Amino acid sequence: MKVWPPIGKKKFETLSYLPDLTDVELAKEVDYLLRNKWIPCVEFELEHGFVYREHGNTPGYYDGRYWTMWKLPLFGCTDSAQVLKEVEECKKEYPGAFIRIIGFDNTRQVQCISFIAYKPPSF
Amino acid sequence: MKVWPPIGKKKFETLSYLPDLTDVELAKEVDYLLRNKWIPCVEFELEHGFVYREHGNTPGYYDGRYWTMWKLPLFGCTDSAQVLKEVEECKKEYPGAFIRIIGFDNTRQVQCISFIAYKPPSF
Amino acid sequence: FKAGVKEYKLTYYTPEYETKDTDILAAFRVTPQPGVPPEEAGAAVAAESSTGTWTTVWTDGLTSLDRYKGRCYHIEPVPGEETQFIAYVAYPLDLFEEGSVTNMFTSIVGNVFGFKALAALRLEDLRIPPAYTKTFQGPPHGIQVERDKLNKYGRPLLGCTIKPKLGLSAKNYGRAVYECLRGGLDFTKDDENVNSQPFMRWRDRFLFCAEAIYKSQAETGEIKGHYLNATAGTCEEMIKRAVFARELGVPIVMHDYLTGGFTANTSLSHYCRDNGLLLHIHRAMHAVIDRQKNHGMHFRVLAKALRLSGGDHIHAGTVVGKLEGDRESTLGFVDLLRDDYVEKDRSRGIFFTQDWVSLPGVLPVASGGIHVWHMPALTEIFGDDSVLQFGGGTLGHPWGNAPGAVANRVALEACVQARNEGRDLAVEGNEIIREACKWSPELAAACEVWKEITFNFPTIDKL
Amino acid sequence: FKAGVKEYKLTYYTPEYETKDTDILAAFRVTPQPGVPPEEAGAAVAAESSTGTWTTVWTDGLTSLDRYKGRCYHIEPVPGEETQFIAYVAYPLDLFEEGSVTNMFTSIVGNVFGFKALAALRLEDLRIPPAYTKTFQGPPHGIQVERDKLNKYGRPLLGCTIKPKLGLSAKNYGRAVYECLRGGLDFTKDDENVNSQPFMRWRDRFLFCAEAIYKSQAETGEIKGHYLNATAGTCEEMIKRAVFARELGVPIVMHDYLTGGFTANTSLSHYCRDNGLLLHIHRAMHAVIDRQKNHGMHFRVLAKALRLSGGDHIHAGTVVGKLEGDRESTLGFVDLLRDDYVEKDRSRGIFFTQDWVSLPGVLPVASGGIHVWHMPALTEIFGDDSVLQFGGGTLGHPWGNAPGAVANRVALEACVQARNEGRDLAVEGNEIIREACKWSPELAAACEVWKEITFNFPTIDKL
Ligand SMILES: O=C(O)[C@@](O)(COP(=O)(O)O)[C@H](O)[C@H](O)COP(=O)(O)O
Ligand SMILES: O=C(O)[C@@](O)(COP(=O)(O)O)[C@H](O)[C@H](O)COP(=O)(O)O
Ligand SMILES: [Mg+2]
Ligand SMILES: [Mg+2]
């Protein structure tokens, strides 16, 4: 038996139990998002990488769920490279930020995909 | 079609929708009581021949349910004529009274039979 | 701890077990799939209704399966079936939440009926131990208290479902109730599906039915009731309805315990005990569960469950009316509803001896497709501690509700006096009814209408 | 008015009727007794589930049967079946109490299943019109809200029933919950029959489970839940338990909607809407009702009734696991649970087109006898909007709960990426799993234990 570490294993929701994705693997996730007609959007965070409770504690209330939006959603986008270009541009201005890619279905109005694309060196 | 009278048809629970019992039929019901090992008792009433609500009106509360006990239940008596003698004693002492015969099952503590035996001239 | 799948019978088939006096016992009619031996089928039913799942879990070692596991302790074949068998399962007392029929069913019938390895499954009976029975209030009042509150002794009670089932207004409902009650019925009732609806809202109906109860009681001199339906979409709506019945001072409400459900029904039963209201239970939905012989739950299981959760009446079938009711099976569960102690009697489907430790008894209610000509058989089947209900048999009389009620009341009292004087209701019933028509033109008119009406069909659920 | 019995078909068989867009529609699988015509059997079902009884009542003339009666409007013989047919019944909107599943079932399935003249009866589907749907709250939150509250996107959620079913102490329950959640599961849960019992009282369990939720959430950085069971014997106890879960600030509770009942479930659904609690619904007892093809109610009817009464999850079967669930029927009622509009499609058991008029969607939960090798098939059947639950499949891992949770999480995410990069889960599933064993030891240990475990038996309820 091997024991699952109780430290140093902080997670990032979907895909974060797999080894870190490669840039082609990140591009292929964007490809899947676009093939499903979802709207891609980049979000980034510099201070609270994980959910916390500071301002409330009632059922279903947490802090740290909202990140900051990077520009706007790429409506009518057709290139996963354009999404990765904004991740690189965000990486360059905020190298200490976590950065994630999300995807919206505007008919159901639900984010149908979400995965981290960059983690800062402080992590 | 015949219309059921809405007046002049006051009733007295079990058997009161049949023709009045003869003295042989009254005794026949007393025989049934005794055959079942029930213990008979006579009750009579001079003022409230029917249930009413004077002292309360909550669910399951009514006045006029208790009548007055004639003597005591005839424990160990197994002759119908003894019971009917008690009706006769009651009826001569209280000719203006309603008089009924009841029978208890003491294992279940349920009155298993009850029927009118005399109704006063005022009725 | 050894990880992996093993057979349930290695842990849950214990044919050597002796049931404890605190165990809840269950008798299951099991039809396993081809290739599945009865020992394994029975052990899977015991395992997955108590402590077990499909693979070995290490957490078993933190407690004691010995004290907690359900156990299939006996397996007996079914005469006339090649694969089907009865499996007897014993459940420790600690498995169950006190006072909760909901929890008891959740274990015993929660998941096992859907196992792929079983082709069919039916719970036939349960043995409820005294140590579990004493955790339940049971009926708010019960047979003895009900007769005493209403001052009614010596004969079955008489009731009647207002018809048409749906579509009547509140004022027309109270009109029908008054005319029925004043003719000699002790009760009338909302149909099971009369709750609150566009054609008639509940509060309006309650108000007019109260006017009818008290008018008919003042007229006749006999205590009257009308089962006011508390069944509702939410517990809050259900309780609101009962509170208004309480305000009105009336004696009896009703609940559809299966469609409302056991959690709600137990709440209402407690309310009725707290406020002195009789509680008539309608078994709507039961035949979805209890009709077929090979799968489901027998009504005697649902009847015991109602006695535990609580109700003063429960419908028990007619045998001879429009809904199915096997005679010997019905006599069995009528005893289980009324009596303090019922010995095992497989000839009447009673799989286990059942001690009720003075839990109050429930009045069985015979209702559905019955009329005056049925009175001798009903009186003979059920005896004095029952309610006989004539909806169509009252509102279908050619002279109206009051003469229909008189016909039914005369027909019943004729049977009582005949039986009390020695006549056999089971053989002289038509004579008894016929002879009573002489001085009762009302009964005569009902006899003419329904003389050739009988309900004889193949019995689906035979003993 | 003419007293006496008529055939039901004279009033209630109306094959020319045109259904209205406000009607509730029902498809019944009817098996009449020998000698009973389908038109009369179908009229009897329509009559005794709406306005009629066994004999003509004069009160019909006070109202309008034309506007209130249910109508058997169509008869559809069943192929390969001599006497069995589908009967189609339309019920006017006014028959039903707004917001009350209890009332809807009381009419449609109340008495008709016990009729002597029928040998068997099953309700297969119902068409709920938008005019009645809008009287229901439905789920307290629904799929979109739940994912938003939990911050979980792009994959199925993962759950796990703590085991053994019964017998664990409160402290030991919380220990298992912590070790499960910290390994990558989103949820754990009380077993359906874990309520409050001598071996573990509910309030102690809720307290220690809260400690485990917050410890594992702090450790992993992901929002965690444990379904705390509010099922109880009375509505008062049920609400008490939900109030304490609200005090603790936890995200999700659960309820056994069938053993608790619809009246209690609707009350709990409203409470959860009022207080922001997700409500996982366990379908304990459903197979008593839904297993056999000839009698009962199909699960799709029970699933629609839950979506009306209210729940954020409901168990919907696995297809591949230990409990029965036909694949095509399951695909049909999963759509009925999740989607806003579902077109009629008998190939998936959908008898009526169902419009949900924006009522929230319910997350289907696949649970029971599933393990790591089933992950590709489960992901393929249900897609991202599901909960896949592994009780024995986690607490059965040879290294314990955290490695067991890691195995399930890794397998799931490996299926997701493989799918998202264009692979065929239905054909490459086993190779996808073997590739992940290459870098996940936790998954490798799980695959070795369960490699040869499948559940394949003849399906009882087929289309
Ligand atoms: O809806 C009905 O049909 C009834 O009102 C009877 O009406 P009628 O008196 O007009 O027949 C009763 O609720 C049924 O007897 C219930 O069935 P059961 O007692 O078997 O549960
Ligand atoms: O009691 C059980 O068996 C479970 O906890 C599963 O345990 P495992 O995960 O250990 O198998 C679930 O409640 C069943 O899946 C319910 O069945 P369904 O989902 O069909 O309603
Ligand atoms: Mg009815
Ligand atoms: Mg479970």
Residue numbers in the entry:
A (entry chain I), B (entry chain J): 1 to 123
C (entry chain B), D (entry chain A): 13 to 475
Article sentences:
Ribulose-1,5-bisphosphate carboxylase/oxygenase (Rubisco) catalyses the addition of carbon dioxide to ribulose 1,5-bisphosphate (RuBP) in the first step of the photosynthetic Calvin–Benson–Bassham cycle. Rubisco catalysis occurs at the interface of two ∼55 kDa large subunits (LSu; encoded by the rbcL gene in the plastome). Rubisco in higher plants also contains ∼15 kDa small subunits (SSu; rbcS gene, nuclear-encoded), which are produced in the cytosol as precursor SSus with an N-terminal transit peptide. Within the chloroplast, four L2 units assemble into an L8 core, which is capped at each end by a tetrad of SSus, yielding an ∼550 kDa L8S8 hexadecameric enzyme.
Here, we describe the crystal structure of the activated form of Rubisco from A. thaliana at 1.5 Å resolution with a bound transition-state analogue, 2-carboxy-d-arabinitol 1,5-bisphos­phate (2-CABP). Clear electron density was observed for residues 13–475 of the 479-amino-acid LSu and residues 1–123 of the 125-amino-acid SSu. The A. thaliana Rubisco structure is in the ‘activated state’, in which a carbamate formed at the catalytic lysine residue (Lys201) is stabilized by Mg2+. Interpretation of the electron density indicates that the A. thaliana Rubisco SSu protein sequence in the structure presented in this study contains the RbcS1B isoform. There is only one amino-acid difference between RbcS1B and Rbcs2B/RbcS3B in the residues that were resolved in this structure: residue 22 is a serine in Rbcs2B/RbcS3B and is a threonine in RbcS1B and this structure. The resulting occupancies and difference maps were most consistent with this residue being threonine at full occupancy (data not shown). Furthermore, there was no mixture of residues at any given SSu amino acid in the structure, indicating that the Rubisco isoform that crystallized under these conditions was homogenous with respect to RbcS content. Thus, whereas the A. thaliana Rubisco LSu sequence is very similar to that of rice Rubisco (94% amino-acid identity), which is reflected by a high structural resemblance between their LSus (r.m.s.d. of 0.25 Å), a significantly lower structural resemblance is observed in the SSus (r.m.s.d. of 1.20 Å), although the sequence similarity is only slightly lower (72% amino-acid identity) than those for the other crop plants (74–76% amino-acid identity). The crystal structure presented in this study provides the structural framework to interpret A. thaliana Rubisco kinetics and interactions with accessory proteins, and adds to a growing database of higher plant Rubisco structures.
